[PDB]
Amino acid sequence: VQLRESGPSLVKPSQTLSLTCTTSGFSLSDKTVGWVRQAPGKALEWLGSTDTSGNTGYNPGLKSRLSITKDNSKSQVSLSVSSVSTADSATYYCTTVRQQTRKSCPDGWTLAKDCGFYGYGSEDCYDDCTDILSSNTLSPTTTHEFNVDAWGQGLLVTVSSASTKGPSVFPLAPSSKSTSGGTAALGCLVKDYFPEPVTVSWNSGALTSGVHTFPAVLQSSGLYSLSSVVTVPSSSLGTQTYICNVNHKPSNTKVDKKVEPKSC
Template sequence: MFTRRPNTLARAYLLGLLFHNLSGSWAQVQLVETGGKLMYEGQDLTLTCTVSGSLRFSDFSFSWHWSPSGSSKEFVASITAGIGDKQDYRRDIQDRAFISRNNDASRVSLTLRHLRKEDSGIYYCARLTVLRWDTDRWGDFGPGTEVTVIPRDKFYLKELGGGPYPHRLTLSLKCQTSGFQFKTSVLGWYLWDPGHAPRWLSSIDHTSAETNEGRIISSREDNSSQVFLQIKGLGLRDSGHYHCARRVGDKGDTDKLVFGPGTAVTVEPGPRTPLTPSVFLVRNQDAVACLVSDFYPKELHVSLASPRASVSAQALTVASTAHGTYSAIQIGRVGENDSVTCSVQHLGKETLVSYQPDTVKLEPSCPDQEFAAESKQRNKLLLSVLSLRLLFLKIVLINVLFTMIALIF
């Protein structure tokens, strides 16, 4: 019994059958792109292509392509099979693009850094298909994922309604906006107390609002592009700078917050028993400060005066404290050798605190003079003794020299 080699026609038939079976197997491969979304210029974006079907993922090279309208596709980047140790990029994007592969997860990723408006379009993932080498090396394109890059808006945020508010009443603020799509934007309110981190109060979009306390109400009016904030039952801790903010991004952890300039709110302490102030006068060269602490009610008069010179004083600053009282400071300038007096009038009573410069020069006392004379005499005696010792040493050296000469000669 013998076997006959297949002729050329049989070989061609078997090869065609093999190619047909392989093509049928490869036709089951699916590539699905994800990650496309609305982005702002300057942001970074990562697109992902997930590959499924009857193929060994690590055996194939993959690529990404871009189309502005979904018709003709332009090459963006490719990565070789295996560990993907070789990548290729379109020249005008090679400094901003990075392609990678994860063989375990059957994924190919494309990262675009510092997005530009011209990066907008549909991005497709493709596989290297050897059977189409004579027409197009890349095939099995996925459906694509769309990326839209828009310029950062020059928008406007302005808070209104700040000022002094009585204790336990309701705060009402509003924020006027312009320069961006208000209806699709997420806005919020933050409280910043100098010396502390900004505190989130509320966030609101076109469907819902969130607040950190039940006494806080946030609302919006799309027709006028305004957002509002109300806080009921004001307390002393509600004093600070209130800022309206717009969230820029895709609602993730890396979103950027853009704040308005803010408006200052001061919550006045509630009624309590009158409290007499404590007054302190502090001075450093020609600067002087009158400190008035822990008094109630708020009304008082502070002045700085000098009997021999005029005092250049700044405006009085009064602020509420955390424990429901007030403190104040009056700053001024006066000559270094001039005395100064701080006068505080509160509830019909006057408190005076003075500062007298010490201009008297101390003269040395008699014991000090006697001690100085004794020190002078002691120094003279020590110099005399030292001179005698030097003279004695000189004589000894001369005698030794003459003795050596006599012995030699």
């Protein structure tokens, strides 16, 4: 079971953001799906969902601006937010949700469904199912149950009038004066790029030990930059090539940079 968000990473104000979640591992005709979003440094926020019966419900405060649809054949849920602002910048998560309106009866009483009654009065609590027509009746107690079952990885969407910009990748070469005897730190500077995010791997994933991709800084220019470093054996600086594989989906860009060792 997996949920993969797709769509734009940047959206100008007053326009309409639209995402699509493609589902696998299960059958969309057997689960409810929804959308959660989280603004940076803010709490989770609920958007909406659409259940097995194609019925959609929304965050009351955001219903007028929301639109969720679904295609059970294409295994694909869709979200749309209208007239977005910078407040709509957030990471948008696709989720399988468990929504249940639950009716329960006091102790000793029983619901019509459990009595096996059905009909028009199929929603009351009964004193004894032994006699439907002479039993005492209570209105049920209503509890609403909500769970997010599985979470999608998320998709960061930024709302800004500024334009997309890919990254410049500069090597952080390890000098013979920046070694630490046995180990040496080399990296890649990912400079000037918008919007977030950037991800960095090394040797096409085949190098994992010692790696740390730092968070991004927001320069005064309105562009983001970060660095990815890995500490490697200092004896291998001439015998093992080290390539950082940067990836910036917001501009469909992907960079590979040889980090060559400084002559000194």
